[PDB]
Amino acid sequence: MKHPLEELKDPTENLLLWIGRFLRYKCTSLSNSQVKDQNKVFECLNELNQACSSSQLEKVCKKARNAGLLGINTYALPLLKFHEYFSKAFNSLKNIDEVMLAEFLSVYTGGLSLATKKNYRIALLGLFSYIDKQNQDENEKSYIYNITLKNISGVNQSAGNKLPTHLNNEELEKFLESIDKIEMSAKVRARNRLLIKIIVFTGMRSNEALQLKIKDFTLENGCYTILIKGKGDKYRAVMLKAFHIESLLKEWLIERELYPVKNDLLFCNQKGSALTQAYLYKQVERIINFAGLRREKNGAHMLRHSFATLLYQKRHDLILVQEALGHASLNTSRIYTHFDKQRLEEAASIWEE
Amino acid sequence: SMKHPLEELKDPTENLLLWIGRFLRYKCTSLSNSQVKDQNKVFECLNELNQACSSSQLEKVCKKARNAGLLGINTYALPLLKFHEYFSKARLITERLAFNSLKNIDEVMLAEFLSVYTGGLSLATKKNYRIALLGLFSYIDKQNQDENEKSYIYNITLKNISGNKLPTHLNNEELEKFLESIDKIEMSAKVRARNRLLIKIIVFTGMRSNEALQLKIKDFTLENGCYTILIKGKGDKYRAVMLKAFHIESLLKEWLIERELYPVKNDLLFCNQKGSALTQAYLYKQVERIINFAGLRREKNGAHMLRHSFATLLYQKRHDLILVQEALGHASLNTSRIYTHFDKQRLEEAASIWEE
Amino acid sequence: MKHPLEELKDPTENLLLWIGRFLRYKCTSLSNSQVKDQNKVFECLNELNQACSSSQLEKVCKKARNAGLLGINTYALPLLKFHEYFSKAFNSLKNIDEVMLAEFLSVYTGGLSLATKKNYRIALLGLFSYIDKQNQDENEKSYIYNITLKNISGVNQSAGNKLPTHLNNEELEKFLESIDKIEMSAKVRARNRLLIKIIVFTGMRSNEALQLKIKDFTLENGCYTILIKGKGDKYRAVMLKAFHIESLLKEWLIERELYPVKNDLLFCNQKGSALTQAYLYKQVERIINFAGLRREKNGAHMLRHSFATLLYQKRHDLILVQEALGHASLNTSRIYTHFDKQRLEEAASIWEE
Amino acid sequence: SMKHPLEELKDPTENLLLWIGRFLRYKCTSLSNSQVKDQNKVFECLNELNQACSSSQLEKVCKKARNAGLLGINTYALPLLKFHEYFSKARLITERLAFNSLKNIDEVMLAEFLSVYTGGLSLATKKNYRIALLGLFSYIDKQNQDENEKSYIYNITLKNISGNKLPTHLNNEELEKFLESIDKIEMSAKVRARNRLLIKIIVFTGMRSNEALQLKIKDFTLENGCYTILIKGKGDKYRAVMLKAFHIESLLKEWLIERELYPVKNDLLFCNQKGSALTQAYLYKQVERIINFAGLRREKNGAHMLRHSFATLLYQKRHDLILVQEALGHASLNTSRIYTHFDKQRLEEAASIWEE
DNA sequence: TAGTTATGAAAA
DNA sequence: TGCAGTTTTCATAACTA
DNA sequence: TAGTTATGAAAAC
DNA sequence: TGCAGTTTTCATAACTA
DNA sequence: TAGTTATGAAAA
DNA sequence: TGCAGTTTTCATAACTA
DNA sequence: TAGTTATGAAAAC
DNA sequence: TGCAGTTTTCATAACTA
Ligand SMILES: [Cl-]
Ligand SMILES: [Cl-]
């Protein structure tokens, strides 16, 4: 049902009221695939109704995110920062226009990345669009903000579109060698090296590699076909030559038998559960450091960008890049064409004539 | 004039029916009329939509409009009339809540209707119903206005519509077999030359069905063994496609001789015995007949499936999606990707980049 | 100064009132370079003020167009057709929305080309945008139509963007031969053949060729540089090998001495004035007919499209096409890339493998 | 809050001054702050624009903002303050007509101001003044609102702004001479290695001035004799450019050794003796010094002129405007065309298409 | 035969 | 990641000079 | 003959 | 980066000392 | 020297 | 044909540890 | 040791 | 054809039988 735009005497509390509604609305629409316990999310749902303060909204949203409802983080923090802006420094909610929002973005996201700025703007757009569709007074009249925020700097594409940090061909080989060269304890060496090499050789995402199942591995003519579970019982596939991981895979599978592994996980901690992104990052980063390859990004996804880049350099096949990386949009795949050596060569070689 | 108060009738059902008619009429003036032969048929539909005060009238007139060439009206008419049926039935059967006034029509109500009337339908069809509903209430929001110049705001924004299937294209080998089957399958002497030329042109160019059926001889330009064909495409988008002459030279000359005995109209390349353009129904049955004969039946079995096959082969040989985009007449890579199918086995081309 | 939106009791006359203002406004802003007598235009200016009927507006606009104010034709006829639509079949000007305009476009432009439809729409957009900026009542309040007409079919680019009718390489040669092969009287043969060949060899526009001056011809190393006067004392240049027109040029220049030529015109009628587009068209068309090359377009501009096309086929230089044809926008030059044989070949030749 | 009635002050001059301040303040929050070192300087400007009630204050604060990194504010400030001067002077000197109330500010008035204050200015500058004025009254139209929620509408839409000059680029031969002059001209041992490397990189890549001055060593990647350079460009647009190593290898190694003696900050490739990035002023004077020495002075004599020279040469060798578009970091062919200059003599390449 | 309308559905 | 929304074909049923 | 003016329509900038 | 907006030709009628 | 701010103007 | 409008460089003047 | 959870921030879809 | 909008990782803190 719709509520009047101004139900409370205090516009600050009234703003908090609409934010709580919007956040609860998003909690029901956003993906809950990473949610381990749906009961916790169900608790968060009604808690967003009984929440009457900024601290409570933040507390619940953190609880929901930590439960597996990850998407809520992109909306919660920015909007609650706006409530702080609106509360500190204005009699009505109608005073809120794009000019006020511009001032808010400047003050709160001024020292933040352009990508973060966009997240704040998108969060604002969603909130006031939600308000525009859910408000209606006793006189059956609705107030329409119609906020679009088009005049804000660095909000469109190509603005702050930082080309993905990655390794080239030579740097990748040095990283591969560094995996086997860096020291690791006997308890984790086989598992960790296998995990990171699979990521390097496939461009697999972090959570994709961490949730890999053994039954999804198929070996045919020296080639592994690895199935990766996606959204809604959907599977995507990647391929990997056996000789890259063959001896290392067998070594880990033997050790794995001494682990209390659950749910047919290929990789797991000592408790048998899937490894975290935190552990995977630190294991990847220390190798990056050891290889003297430290840069703007030093995680597993940086390796993912490296594979995509290498693949285009070697094949110049846009769709092959899409299908291998698992891109839903060719816009994403087209990003890696910006590193096309053969294309860059055409321009740089004009001086040789 | 074109603006009316939201509720003019005591009957919300009749009033909802009223707005639907107004919206569909607006669409008959705003949607493409390129396929319309006689514009007078459109004007008749425009007037008949005004005098319409029932569901049967609206359906008959919109069908009349579609059959006259205004093809786009078919996507809006039926879904809205099904909602009017839903609203009308609910108001009579369930005397409660929203169905007492169209002011109480909201997102929850539209969601239930889509859940009831689009049960065993594809996601694409469900998407069509949704877009239709959104358009109707967008029109009402813009066009409703009382005596005091005050309007009611719906602001309805429905959320997006969230096993493996058979192939929707012929691969390289299957394409070769289809081409052979075109010649191998039996056709009467009266139609064999014309029909073979028609289908083959479609195969080698990726031409849409209507684009092929409306080919004029003046659309062809021969130079150094190459036919440059000008195509008035979907949405009246023009593009040029090339067809090597050796693919159709003997077949074209054979049909053109037969064509002299036809009372051809509008300089059409292909025509029936009456001289008029062939229909999609005939083309489909002719194509499916060959597909079935070659044992190549799959998810789609029409000329459009051959269009998929063309784009897939084109990218397979050139690895250039822009080139596909040019040949098919698209504006973006995403749309061309729909026709460009990727064989999963080609993933080993990605796995082998490390060995080089 | 601004006027109230509704100054008259009759909305029909009030609409006619705004149209007359808009047309007069355009007559002052539109280019008057083709105007032979500025006095006639000055007369049309005040006549648009004293005009109190549709017939008078049409009469004046025709007068203005025939005087050299060509651009007025694109606005006059469509808007007066709208007044007819509004008068026939509504108490106020406020009733006019994009829904009414959609009905008007369907009824009046239904049997017309998509390009003509766009001209009607553009004319409407200008009128109601002009009204939005020039209306204000006694209460200092303005009514804003804000008409954009985005939901109308075939209004954007790529919609009805008919690829320019033209001749290919072989057809061009046959046309060139046909110029010398077709029969012409001794009084006009040298002049006409020279005129048409210059157009063919340069892709020059009709009015460009008709207004050519002798002083703008420069011969250097067997190559003619021809200057073409553009807008505001601006000149563009084309080049032409002498051997194409050398003997034919000298022949006409001798005959030209028996003409009372004015203003250093290269081509002229018997009265010494510049030839018309009408005469040039008929002379070009009859050759097209004679060559068996008749098609969708059979004028001098069709030859212009042919040159642009041939130039790209031979050079594949987009900027060269722009500079040779005199395009202000590369959007125009890029049109001829759609006929790129080498590009089309890449797709058609997939069956040969 | 951000909305105020159109006329709050009895003095229309003070009131016009008031709206200008509000508009410029909004621009300080909406324009790019990527060049701003200390964001606190921006916040100071924001507060000082509120307490400002005069022209001198607005100018000082906007200058302070520009000098702090908010470069875009310079295009709006001066033209509007010149209009405020025009309005203020006219109201005092000519006690008549529009200058009694800012409600009477219209198109005719703005046209006269542009005619008076932009006499001896370029068309581009005139265009800047126009855009500034349009932005101001667009802001006022959106932000004015009385106690009765009623607003005044300006709806001001100014019409567009309607001998031969010296070259604005170096051709192929001149480029070669410039490169020679870089080495031939005399520089002190302290700056010769650094300055030569800087300018040469600009020449061979078409890099913008600030893009070059802000180069980090981590931006360079060497592979098979090729340097791939990542550039954070204008409008924070990222692009990669390639530079063959043999052009700068000996010069780069020479400077890097000197660089070890510098207190370099932020891993900058080029820096002054303080370790901070070099200024556009220094770069310009260094470039113009070489140009003048080579006798190549023309319409433009800065590093941007070299950027023109790069694009012109690039298209001359490749005939690919998209390639130019990629190297320069543009979104359209029209913008790249600005840098791509066409030699009129090449028209004979068009005249010779008939002879083939 | 040799094709045509008409149409709810499914894309493009 | 996937729409905005207009404009086509699918895939038959029913029919005939 | 050898051209013109006038014009709705259709582009071409 | 497409658009709104401006400028020109199409293509034929109806002439004419 | 070896560079820096500051700035009205002119583009991009 | 050429903008919408934000974000840069031009091209000096004036100055100095 | 060998990993975890929590988190503002920054992307990556 | 860019977007609004959704989903995921970065990268570090603070732990701990
Ligand atoms: Cl993606
Ligand atoms: Cl152009």
Numbering used by the authors:
A (entry chain A), C (entry chain A): 1 to 89, 98 to 361
B (entry chain B), D (entry chain B): 0 to 161, 168 to 361
What do the authors report?
In bacteria and archaea, chromosome dimers are monomerized by members of a large family of tyrosine recombinases, the Xer recombinases. Many other organisms (including Lactococcus, Helicobacter, Campylobacter spp. and archaea) employ a single Xer recombinase system, with a prime example, XerH/difH, found in Helicobacter pylori, a gastric pathogen implicated in peptic ulcer disease and gastric cancer. Xer recombinases are members of the tyrosine site-specific recombinase superfamily, a large group of enzymes that catalyze DNA breakage and rejoining using a conserved tyrosine nucleophile. Here, we present two crystal structures of the H. pylori XerH recombinase in complex with its recombination site difH.
Attempts to co-crystallize XerH with suicide versions of the native difH sequence were unsuccessful, but palindromic difHLP suicide substrates gave us crystals that diffracted to 2.4 Å. Most strikingly, the difH DNA is now strongly bent. The bend mainly originates from a single distortion within the central region of difH: bases A17’ and G18’ are un-stacked with a 90° tilt, which introduces a kink resulting in asymmetric bending of the DNA (insert in Figure 4B). Each subunit is rotated by ~22° in the post-cleavage structure, resulting in major rewiring of the inter-subunit interactions and an overall compaction of the complex. At the same time, helices αN and αO of molecule A are rotated by ~30°, bringing the catalytic Y344 to a suitable position to attack one strand on each difHLP DNA forming a covalent phosphotyrosyl bond (left). Interestingly, despite the symmetry of the palindromic difHLP substrate, the two bound XerH molecules (A and B) are in different conformations. Their overall structures are similar (r.m.s. deviation 0.78 Å for Cα carbons), but important protein segments that contain catalytic residues (the β2-β3 turn with K239, and αN-αO carrying Y344) are in different conformations. Consequently, subunit A assumes a fully active conformation, while subunit B is in an inactive conformation with the catalytic tyrosine distant from the scissile phosphate. In the active subunit (molecule A, left), R213, H309, R312, and H335 make hydrogen bonds with the scissile phosphate (orange), K239 contacts the base of the adjacent nucleotide A12, and Y344 is covalently attached to the DNA.
